[PDB]
Design a protein around this ligand. Sequence first.
Ligand SMILES: CCCCCCCCCCCCCCCCCC(=O)OC[C@H](COP(=O)(O)OCCN)OC(=O)CCCCCCCCCCCCCCCCC
Ligand SMILES: Nc1ncnc2c1ncn2[C@@H]1O[C@H](COP(=O)(O)OP(=O)(O)O)[C@@H](O)[C@H]1O
Lengths: 83, 47, 344, 115, 112, 98, 320
Amino acid sequence: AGRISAFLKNAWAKEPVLVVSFSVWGLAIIMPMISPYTKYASMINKATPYNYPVPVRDDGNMPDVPSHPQDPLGPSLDWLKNL
Amino acid sequence: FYVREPVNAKPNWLAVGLSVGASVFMWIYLIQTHNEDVLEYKRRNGL
Amino acid sequence: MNPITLAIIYFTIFLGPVITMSSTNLMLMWVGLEFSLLAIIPMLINKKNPRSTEAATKYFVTQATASMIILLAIVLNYKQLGTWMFQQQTNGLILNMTLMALSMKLGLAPFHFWLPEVTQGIPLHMGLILLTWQKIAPLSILIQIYPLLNSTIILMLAITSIFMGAWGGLNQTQMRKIMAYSSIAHMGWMLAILPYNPSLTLLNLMIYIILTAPMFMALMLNNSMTINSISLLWNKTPAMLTMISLMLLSLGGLPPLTGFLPKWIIITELMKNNCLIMATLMAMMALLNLFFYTRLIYSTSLTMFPTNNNSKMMTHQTKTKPNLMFSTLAIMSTMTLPLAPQLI
Amino acid sequence: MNLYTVIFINILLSLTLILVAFWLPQMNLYSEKANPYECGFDPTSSARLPFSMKFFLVAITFLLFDLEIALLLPLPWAIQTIKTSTMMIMAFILVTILSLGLAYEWTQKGLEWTE
Amino acid sequence: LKKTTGLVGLAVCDTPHERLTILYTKTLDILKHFPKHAAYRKYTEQITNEKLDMVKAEPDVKKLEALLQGGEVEEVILQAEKELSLARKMLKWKPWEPLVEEPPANQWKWPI
Amino acid sequence: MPSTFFNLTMAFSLSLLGTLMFRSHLMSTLLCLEGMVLSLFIMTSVTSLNSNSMSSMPIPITILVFAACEAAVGLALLVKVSNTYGTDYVQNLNLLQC
Amino acid sequence: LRYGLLAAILGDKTTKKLHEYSRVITVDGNICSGKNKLAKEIAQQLGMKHYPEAGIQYSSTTTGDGRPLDIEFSGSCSLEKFYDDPKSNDGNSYRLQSWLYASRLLQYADALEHLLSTGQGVVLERSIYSDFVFLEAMYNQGYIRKQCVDHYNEIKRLTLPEYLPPHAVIYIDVPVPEVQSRIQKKGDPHEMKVTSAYLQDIENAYKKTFLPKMSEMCEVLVYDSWEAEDPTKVVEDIEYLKYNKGPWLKQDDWTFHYLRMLVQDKTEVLNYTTIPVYLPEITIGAHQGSRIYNSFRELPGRKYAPGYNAEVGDKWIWLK
Ligand SMILES: CCCCCCCCCCCCCCCCCC(=O)OC[C@H](COP(=O)(O)OCCN)OC(=O)CCCCCCCCCCCCCCCCC
Ligand SMILES: Nc1ncnc2c1ncn2[C@@H]1O[C@H](COP(=O)(O)OP(=O)(O)O)[C@@H](O)[C@H]1O
């Protein structure tokens, strides 16, 4: 267009502040929606063991991680490394 | 003759169909809702 | 006023109760009293005269102190039995200072001296919001404490609101200071029966809101804030006299009209709970709450005060009264006595 | 305790430096140098009258925002929550309604020095 | 067709050839109430009837300026409505009256 | 903890005892209304901080977003008390009783 | 739609309608000093319309059939009965005047409806603000009590400042021995037999009070009979005029909307004219009024709202 697209041209010459603000506003919410790496923020932040991981007791069930930490089962995050 | 014409010289024909038609929907939903229930009151203890 | 300001302030008003309702925490339930306290003041002050400012200050300072005296009782309760609710075994003066503060939000015993002063010096619109809508959220504090109110001081605040809202309403020519003292009289009925089946105070509120709203809206129609101005109404809109004779003889409860229903079945709940000597002191003084309605419908209806000839123009210019808001609220009251079992 | 050792000092470094300013100048205070200034004349009014500011509305918008600033400050910890999608949105919602609240005042002549 | 005058607070007031004519024609009419022998009426009619002809014949502003000195035409409309305001003052006053009231008492022989 | 809350409850009350006895200023009563809030901030924080009730720690700020928004509406009325009188004395507003 | 508030949001903005000639001009003077060749011919020469003098019977012309009704319905004034017999204990000197204030106000209100929609100017004549001239002329001479002048300036305090000023008033003085001549050369007996002291208190009550207190809120074009009587050069001074110095320019659209809902509701235009200040000149009692209110609704054509009268047409008397 012209009657909208050339209005931005004076608003970029004069008033060259609100254009950045109104852009960075509209450019902030939009980028996490088109990212490859936004999934990890809720995951890198979920891996941190701030509290102690209480172990369950073996009752003939849950073929998960055995009583050994370096055992290939369980949430072995090799994605944080080699990000 | 009302030199300053009334706001209501003609019937606002929407307000008729809004008011007539609404009432006829009320009844038809008020009639069925009773018949639908009395018939359904008669399937819990007896007739 | 600018609609982007109106809608925001007509909506904070819609949040105050609704958050005082849809919230169990006594902190969400507190802020709801404040949304109904911020929002009101911009519309009290629409004229910015020496009557609107003095009311808002007399509405704000009188009513923020109450929001603190409430909030004390939460924190005093947040310590004891740590949570955000008046549970069952909370201390008395926590709640007798809570009920104290609500009585200031509403205006009952000597806490009424701000209500007429504020309900005076104010438009008629925004006289209707205080006495009807600002009153719902404070009661929502006060139905949730269904038991566990001091039956002693909850009841002196009633009688003191029957007296002071009846003795005072006699003097007052300005309708706005009359309806203020009607709110105070009728609250002794809402507030005395609060421990005693408060499905009757939710009633007396929904009745009282149906009585005032036609009245304040019957005064919008000509902006008559004086007996001598509601009098000259047979010349402007004589068609209105048929309701106001009933709107007032009901709002002062006489039996064939619904406004005797709350005053009546309340007393049943009072008699049935062995307080035979209290209800009498009310009902003997609810008759005094007719004398300035008997006298008022005389001056309005049953004797034509001497009008003006400048009022002859008013018999040319075709007003417009609301629709569904007066005819309903004046027949849905004053003619619903036989449907009392449906009410309760 | 370790800070009280820092800061009671600085009061004394100030308080010891002021006592050695009133009791070591050799003063001569009589009448006319104690009286107020106004550039070589006797002041007309009393120096303590209503100023009648003009930025009165902006002082309040600050009074509201100092809360809002305070209402931002827990973001460095909020990112260390496991959700980081309500913290995402609700941080946009707070900053946006602010600018909306700031842009309304910006157009309705709030921060404009009534005159 | 005048964007920005050199002057300040003297707005364009477009549509000249009217106001310059509404005013001069209105001086001629607020004249004719004076005496004919009063020389103010005698002289300012010799002024306006020139300028009125230097507008009633010339439609182009930029050359009209070079006919009635007083360039920046809009500065003339300020003057035309000012003389107009003065004839009214000269009407309620009576300047054409006889030789001076209270002549001077040896008041001006300068060398003392 | 049960030596401050008697001492903070007693600090609330003195401020409640202050914002009911006036001294010819509306702007010292609004002023006494913020120290009233302040004792509730602290007597709420500690209760939420000896009990380790971090889930209630959002509350001592929500109480206080309505300590300034109420002061804001409070301060802004003085602008409309002054512009009638220019003096801000509580004794000067008594023309409602009429 | 009744313009509501939705229409404004939906789009009926008034600044959007304001033309250059969307100016509520007025003209003022004395009782036989132009205004009838001047109010007209400022309208026709500029583009806007013309409201004439609001007599006793303005409200009757804008309502119903527009026919001038009986004197008792439109007041009880009888201007002709004032001149020939003033100072009557049957208060007519003031009934004549409070009724005209109301009708000079309904006139001005009915203008702003039209100024603030389909934007045209309005050419009034002796608008609201030049209505006190008679009273002072009627009070300085003995016709009205001081217990009644207060009733008027009260009403002006309650109705005036809600409205906007007459927006470049016009005036033509004329020496009081001359206006007495135009009356007597105008074959009316009632306007005759008037004191020329009442027409010197008419312009002593103009240039001392009106013209100065209006030359700050609005604009003044003080002319004379000969500067007028050629009504094009009065118009030309209105065209090439530099509008400033008033409340018209320092206010916004939503200042018109709550002035435009103020002015539609004619009941709201007139609430403070009907105040119950019980004066015997203006109080009329019940039996004198109930006889008239009911014998006005018995009129062939009012009887009801302005749209439901089967005796004067109104064919759809049962839906609309
Ligand atoms: C049934 C058992 C249950 C208990 C029943 C209890 C009793 C019923 C309640 C009675 C109280 C209401 C009646 C009192 C109203 C006051 C008097 C009144 O309104 O009339 C006076 C008024 C005079 O005004 P005026 O200017 O002279 O005009 C006269 C004609 N227009 O005249 C008027 O102009 C007013 C009317 C003008 C508009 C026409 C409407 C006529 C009135 C219709 C209402 C009739 C009553 C309804 C039926 C009874 C209900 C049970
Ligand atoms: N209060 C009043 N007292 C006397 N005359 C009045 C009053 N109100 C209106 N009028 C009349 O209004 C008339 C104005 O007449 P004029 O200016 O000649 O023509 P127009 O009626 O068209 O303005 C006068 O006859 C005057 O007497």
